Structure 1
Amino acid sequence: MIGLVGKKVGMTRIFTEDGVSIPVTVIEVEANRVTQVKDLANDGYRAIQVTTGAKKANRVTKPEAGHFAKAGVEAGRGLWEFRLAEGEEFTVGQSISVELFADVKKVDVTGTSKGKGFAGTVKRWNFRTQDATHGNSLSHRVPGSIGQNQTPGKVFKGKKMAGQMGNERVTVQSLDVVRVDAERNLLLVKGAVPGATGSDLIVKPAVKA
């Protein structure tokens, strides 16, 4: 089923009557207005493209302005779509709000996690380092060996080495929703979501049973 695109505000918690702390993540979702609809006849797959938020008029390029003008909607901060679930019909310009998540009870949150820069082996793949003493010289946090001897004579693809951690589009699954309220355009979801405050997030109903 179709999802939504929102913005990360922060982390808080909601207290229940029995005294249980449920850490929630505040997702701020504007009116997701549909800008394009795709079907088998035109594109071969059923999905509708949606935008969110508003963008300054000067920063809107002319090709983007015409595309938004065709749909009759105003500018948006970004462009996303959600694959249709074979039977749902939507019309260009239809604005979707957070009422669609009032019964999912489980959501999937997708976003670009925080970039940690060019990270080391210890930080990236949770390598635990060597000894810092007992004669060790000039090699403490280094990866160490990178394979076999002459007979392969090469390093295999996908070898765990130094590289950046984060700053990648990653999805966390099966997040329990806590409270939905369209009167403040907020989505309270239990758990921690990828990305920093203010990052654009893609939230969809959970695919896992």
Structure 2
Amino acid sequence: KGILGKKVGMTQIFTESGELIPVTVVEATPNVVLQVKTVETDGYEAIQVGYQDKREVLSNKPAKGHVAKANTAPKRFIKEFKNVELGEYEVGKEIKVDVFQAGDVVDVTGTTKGKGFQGAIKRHGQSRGPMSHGSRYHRRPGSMGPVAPNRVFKNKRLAGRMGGDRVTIQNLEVVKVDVERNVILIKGNIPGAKKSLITIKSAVKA
């Protein structure tokens, strides 16, 4: 079980018993199965899924041809889902939020917000140097290594572009499903900026 949606934002919800929990609102306009991959044709089993109808002028003839089989408008996002029952899916089939029910445990994948070039202190949570007592070492990445190798070992973490990575949060709870609004309320917070792509899947650990 899986679906693709757009990270609408964050709010909070009162459960029964009056508890208050943070939820992330993820909207998922019905995704469409654009292609079915099998061991015969591709060597592995999975279904290609498209989401977020795209303006035609924003699409290419090759892209339109690919989606023609499913007989739907061009989709902005396309992703393959594995570990699903291919028998249950066919090109042109629709997937709605109702695939999930409240109380489900899911893995949510997103692309972390990009911070750009960041120093080691922020990027790797390393310790500053003393800010006084004559210190001229505040936000620097520490020693690069011992003398003997005459080089620097790999993974000596340094400043660089931070964020924008594929991150999965495991075992988030599906608080609610609104089919009329194609909304899934997921307990907690999930990676990615608002309007970014989000991938909900049934938790693998479960």
TM-score, reference length from structure 2: 0.95
Query: Deviations 1:128-152 (Å, cap 9, x if unpaired)?
Result: 2000111123x31111211101x11
CA RMSD of the aligned region, Å? 1.4
Paired with 1:104 and 1:72, the residues of 2 have a C-alpha distance of 34
**Residue type of the alignment partner of 1:33:** V
Paired with 1:62 and 1:87, the residues of 2 have a C-alpha distance of 28
Paired with 1:170 and 1:164, the residues of 2 have a C-alpha distance of 16
After superposing on structure 2, the runs of 4+ consecutive aligned residues of structure 1 that deviate more than 6 Å are none
TM-score, reference length from structure 1: 0.94
Structure 1 gaps, min length 5: none
Paired with 1:169 and 1:26, the residues of 2 have a C-alpha distance of 19
Structure 2 gaps, min length 5: none
Aligned residues: 206
Match of 1:174 in 2: 171
Q: Shift of residue 81 of structure 1?
A: 1.2
Q: Say whether 1:158 aligns with 2:138.
A: no
Match of 2:98 in 1: 99
Q: Say whether 1:40 aligns with 2:39.
A: yes
User: Higher strand fraction: Structure 1 or Structure 2?
Assistant: 2
Q: Shift of residue 87 of structure 1?
A: 6.2
- Greater CA drift, 65-74 or 108-117: 65-74
| C-alpha contact (below 8 Å) 1:14/1:21 kept by paired residues | yes
Q: After the TM superposition, which residues 1-209 of structure 1 pair with which residues of structure 2 at under 5 Å, given as runs?
A: 2-85=1-84, 88-102=87-101, 105-137=104-136, 139-149=137-147, 151-209=148-206
Change in 2 beyond 3 A, CA 1:102/1:112: same
**Residue type of the alignment partner of 2:186:** V
| C-alpha contact (below 8 Å) 1:49/1:80 kept by paired residues | yes
Paired with 2:86 and 2:165, the residues of 1 have a C-alpha distance of 33
